Amino acid sequence: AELDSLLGQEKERFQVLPGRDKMLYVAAQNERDTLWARQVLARGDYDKNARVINENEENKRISIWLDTYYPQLAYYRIHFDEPRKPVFWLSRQRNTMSKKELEVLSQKLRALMPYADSVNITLMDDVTAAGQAEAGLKQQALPYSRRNHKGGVTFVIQGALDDVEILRARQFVDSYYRTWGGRYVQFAIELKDD
Amino acid sequence: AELDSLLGQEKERFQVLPGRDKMLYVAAQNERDTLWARQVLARGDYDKNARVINENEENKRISIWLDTYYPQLAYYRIHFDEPRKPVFWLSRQRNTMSKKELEVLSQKLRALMPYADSVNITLMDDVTAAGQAEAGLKQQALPYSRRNHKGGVTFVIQGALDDVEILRARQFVDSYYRTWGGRYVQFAIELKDD
Amino acid sequence: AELDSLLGQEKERFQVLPGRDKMLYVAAQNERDTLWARQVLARGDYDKNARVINENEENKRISIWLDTYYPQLAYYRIHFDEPRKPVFWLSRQRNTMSKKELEVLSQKLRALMPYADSVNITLMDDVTAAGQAEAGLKQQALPYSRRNHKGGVTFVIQGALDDVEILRARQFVDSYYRTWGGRYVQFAIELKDD
Amino acid sequence: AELDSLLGQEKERFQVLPGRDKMLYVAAQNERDTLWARQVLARGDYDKNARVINENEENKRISIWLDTYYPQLAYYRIHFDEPRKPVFWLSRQRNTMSKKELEVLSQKLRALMPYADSVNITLMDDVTAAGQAEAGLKQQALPYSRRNHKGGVTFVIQGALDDVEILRARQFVDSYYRTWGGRYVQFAIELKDD
Amino acid sequence: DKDLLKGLDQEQANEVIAVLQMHNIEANKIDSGKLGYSITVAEPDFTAAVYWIKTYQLPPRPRVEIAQMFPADSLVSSPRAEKARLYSAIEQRLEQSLQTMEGVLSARVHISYDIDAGENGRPPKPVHLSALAVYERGSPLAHQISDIKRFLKNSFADVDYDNISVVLSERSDAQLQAPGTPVK
Amino acid sequence: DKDLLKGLDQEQANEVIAVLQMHNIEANKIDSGKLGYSITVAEPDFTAAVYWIKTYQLPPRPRVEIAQMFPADSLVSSPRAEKARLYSAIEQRLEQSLQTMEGVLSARVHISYDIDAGENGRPPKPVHLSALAVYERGSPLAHQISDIKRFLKNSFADVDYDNISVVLSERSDAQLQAPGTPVK
Amino acid sequence: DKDLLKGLDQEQANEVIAVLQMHNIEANKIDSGKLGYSITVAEPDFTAAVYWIKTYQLPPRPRVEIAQMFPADSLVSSPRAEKARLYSAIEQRLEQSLQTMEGVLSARVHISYDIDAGENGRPPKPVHLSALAVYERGSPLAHQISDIKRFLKNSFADVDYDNISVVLSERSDAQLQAPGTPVK
Amino acid sequence: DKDLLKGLDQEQANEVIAVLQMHNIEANKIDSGKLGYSITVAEPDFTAAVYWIKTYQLPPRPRVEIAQMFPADSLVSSPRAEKARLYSAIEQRLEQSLQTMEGVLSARVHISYDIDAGENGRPPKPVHLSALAVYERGSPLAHQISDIKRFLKNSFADVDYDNISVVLSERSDAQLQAPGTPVK
């Protein structure tokens, strides 16, 4: 019995990736569908080795690896919009790595992920990461306060706020944390009176 | 049993599109009819692969794709008034893309949507997007306040408002969000006293 | 069984139009008679394809089509007093379309409506649309306030009003919205005290 | 069974008109006798097509037709004192239609009414329409106020009024609305205190 | 032969027939003993017969007057109850007296009620009246609007002529034809 | 032959049929003795028949008036209870009287209630009224809006014409056709 | 043939079917005598049928009004209880009257309650109202927002137009298709 | 075939199945007569089924409202008890009325209670409100946050718009798939 029939009725929400270390991976797209597929592999109706990898949790796994062997590296987030060729975003203005060891960085992120074929490391402009976070925030008409410093920027939002100004806030934070990640700019929604 | 008989009595609200990756798609026109057709494909009375795509949800799907591979792109909304030839609206005054890679952008949006034959990318004037939003708002006799800035405009509507001035507001917002989308101009209905 | 016998006793309130895409349409004249004829086609006592089109709803259907492919077009309303030859009213002083593409506009509105034979596009004077709305309003002896601006005009009616002055108002609004439509001039009945 | 025996005992209140589109019409003279004859044609004891046309409702039917194809036409009311030759009253001082297209206007009102043989369009003096409305109003000894403007005149009657002065009012309004119609001069009975 | 109302009383049944015969459907009144009456119409006219029940709110609820809620069977009484039971019988007696004038067919009179006239030290406010009438046709009813307005003036303590408003009309056109059975 | 309502009363059953016959489905009223009525529709029309029960909130709850909650069967009474039971019977009597004007088919009247008028030393505030009406069609209902506004003025102590608001409309278009059985 | 609800009442059962037929699953209403009704759906549709019970909080608890908690069967009563039982019947009567306007299908009205108006020497504060409505579609519901706002103004002592807020919408799109049995 | 809950009521059983079917284990609802229901799951899924009982605190305790602790069956009552039983029925009636707006599926309303407002000579403090809502998806729920905030404003004596806070969200993504039996 192949694993793509042991899952749900739609063979649509789950995409099955053949690995490289003789293991067969299951890629789910949110947390609720991760517990759907981990329940199958835990009752034990599959004779071979399998895993369930998530878009959020495969980021937090190799952020632990990358915080041990390569410290002081300014990166943003890893996107899995197609899981066989992931994209590793990387800051441009805060690293002095040359052309040669960027290939070494890609050939070791390939070793952490046996389901991937190659990791495409790209470099993006660092000013525009703080540019879209501010120009998107003035569009929602929210009060804020920018605090620039070396190696990061933060936006402080305090004051008595009605629910129109904190429902539009939480919809902009969660759509920005998905794209750019919370390693360069972090928001501060603190709700106090005056 | 062909799928257009397994649906409701009228073969009118649902239009069935043959795909390109050996899958057969169902196009519904609102959210309530999406749960009508997804209930059929979930009880499992169809032997082949099928999906239900919606006008609202097929926009939010490839807006995630387009926020990863092509950042800093100023676009408006994708219209599916005929689903085999969708129209990709695109801003004119905020991009410097040449003639050649606009063909590359169309040939990759074709790969995301197997039901489409070609994607017609058009460029429209950016001033008139903020022109119809203001001239339509003065016609409803509403108080407002324009706040121009770089990369977007916002309209703030506050004050004590009776229900004649917030029923005409919500009918103009929802008829404008359907046409132009909420990526360039966003309205702010905040209802507070004085 | 031909469809004109499956309807009510009078073969008078419903007029049956042969289509062009091998479908057979039913034209009702108000909303209550639309649910009379849609109940027949939904219980399924007709072997062929049929629809029920309404005078109000066939306007809102192709106003969505015309707000996507031809923006910035100043039009008023489409009249179906004889359904085989509809009349498309169009503003004169706010468009610079030449003689040739007005034929192209008619030959594509024919493609949206398979029951029609030809669409007669006429151009009418734009000042008289705001002329009959004001001269009809002074005849009812109502207080008002004109606010001219570019691309539209609005009439504001506020103040404490007895029921003689808001029964004559609502009978003049609903008889004017039927003829000219609510795209050029829109009324504002706001009832507040002083 | 001929239709003039299926009606009431008197063959006097109903006059049966042979049509031209192979239909047979019934002319009633008030609203209560319209529901008498429409009840017969709705239970279905007649094998052929028939209608019931009313003096009030045949005016409101082709006033919709005449407000679409011929706007800006100043007319008063259509009289059916003999139904085979109706009289179309028409204003003289507010139209510049020549001799030839007044025949075209009559030959198209004949097409709307298959029971009529010819429509006699006459032109009457416009000052005397406002002349009989004022000289009849001073005879009833009522307080009023004339407000002349372009394209119409209105008479405002306010103040605290006993029932002698609003019973004579409502008997003069309803006998004037039958003759001249409410398109040129409209009365305003507003009853407020002082 | 389809029922639409059953269990009716006497005056509730003789009026529903007067409604349905006015709109050209023929009804039958079938007695059923102590269970009240019942009204059945023909089967082709059953659709129209249901629509004219919803429209006119038939059958008629019985006519309610003020003395029906302040009964004389109570052990104790209040000065508020005795005044509102006294004005409720003047109000019935005035409409018994308007029906015997020439040409009048029906009438309804209303009286303004004072409840805290003497309970807080007010002077009693002036009395207002209002009346309706349905005349036999052919009468010049612009002139008979003053005889009712004269008769009702000095039937109380002190009213004025600007405080009495009578609103009257002529009766509807007569129904004298048999409706007609549906031919099948 | 599928039931959708059973146990109904008389006026709750003659209106649900008037709803369903307006939307081109045919219903049957089956008596069942002392258990009330029951309404069954055809099996192809069962889906549409359930949707027009949810929409119009059918069956109708019985119409509630103010005197039903302050009953006369109480042993003791209060001045707050006797005033709200008196105004509740004037309010029923005025809508009995609007139905006998020419062309009126139904009417509902509302009265503003004073509860602490004399309980704290206030003067009693002015009385407000409001009314509805459903006319027979063909009537110039811009002109008959003053006769109701004159009849309701001097039926109380002291109202003004800016304190009475009557809101009226014409009746809906008539339903005279049989709906039609689903052909199978 | 799997049960999901049993023991339901009449109006609790005719609405759950209206929920499930809107989402393309077909349910059956089985009477069981004095034990109430019961609803069973097909076995391939049992998963979806449980999810639309949790989401819409079905079956409906019966609609609660203020007079149900201050009953008339008490031996004694208070001035706080008689006012909150009086406003609870005006509030029911106003929503009975909004349903007879043209195009209205359902309405709910709310009244602001005063509890220590006269118990500590305050003047009674101004009355506020709020209303809902569900219209028949095709109506220009920007213009009928003033007729409700005029009808509710002078139904009480003294309100202003900035104190009445009516919030209305059009009804949902009609369900006229049979759902369809799961083919096996 | 291992039991995990038994003795449940009706609404306590139709929700535990909605929990367990969301996490891809299949449960069975077995009636047992007057002893209540019982839920049994498969034996390979018994470990996961116990973990999702501890996490969600299942079975649900019945929903508690303020009027359940101040019953009407008491012989005597206090002014503190009648106010907290009156506000407890306005609070239930407002959430019955939010469920009939367009797109709303569930709602819960809370009212601030005054207990020593008039017992020590204070003026009564201003009233605060708060509300929740679960919308049907696809709705622009940034704009419908003002219609609830307008409807709740003039349902009481005197609130301000800075004193009403409504917090709303869209419903979760639908569960329409059968879970799937453990293959052995």
Residue numbers in the entry:
A (entry chain F), B (entry chain G), C (entry chain H), D (entry chain I): 171 to 364
E (entry chain g), F (entry chain f), G (entry chain e), H (entry chain d): 20 to 203
What do the paper's sentences say?
The injectisome is a specialized bacterial organelle that utilizes a type III secretion system (T3SS) to translocate effector proteins from the bacterial cytosol directly into a eukaryotic host. Composed of >20 different proteins, the injectisome forms a syringe shaped nanomachine that spans both bacterial membranes and that of the infected host. The major structural unit of the injectisome is the basal body, composed of three highly oligomerized concentric rings spanning the bacterial inner membrane (IM) (PrgH and PrgK in the Salmonella enterica serovar Typhimurium SPI-1 T3SS)3–6 and outer membrane (OM)7 (InvG, a member of the secretin family of OM pores also found in the type II secretion system, type IV pili system, as well as the phage assembly system). To address this and further elucidate the structural basis for injectisome assembly and function, including that of the central needle component, we have conducted here a cryo-EM analysis of the assembled native needle complex resulting in 3D reconstructions of the IM and OM rings at resolutions permitting atomic model building (3.6 Å and 3.9 Å, respectively) and the 3D reconstruction of an isolated helical needle filament at 3.3 Å resolution.
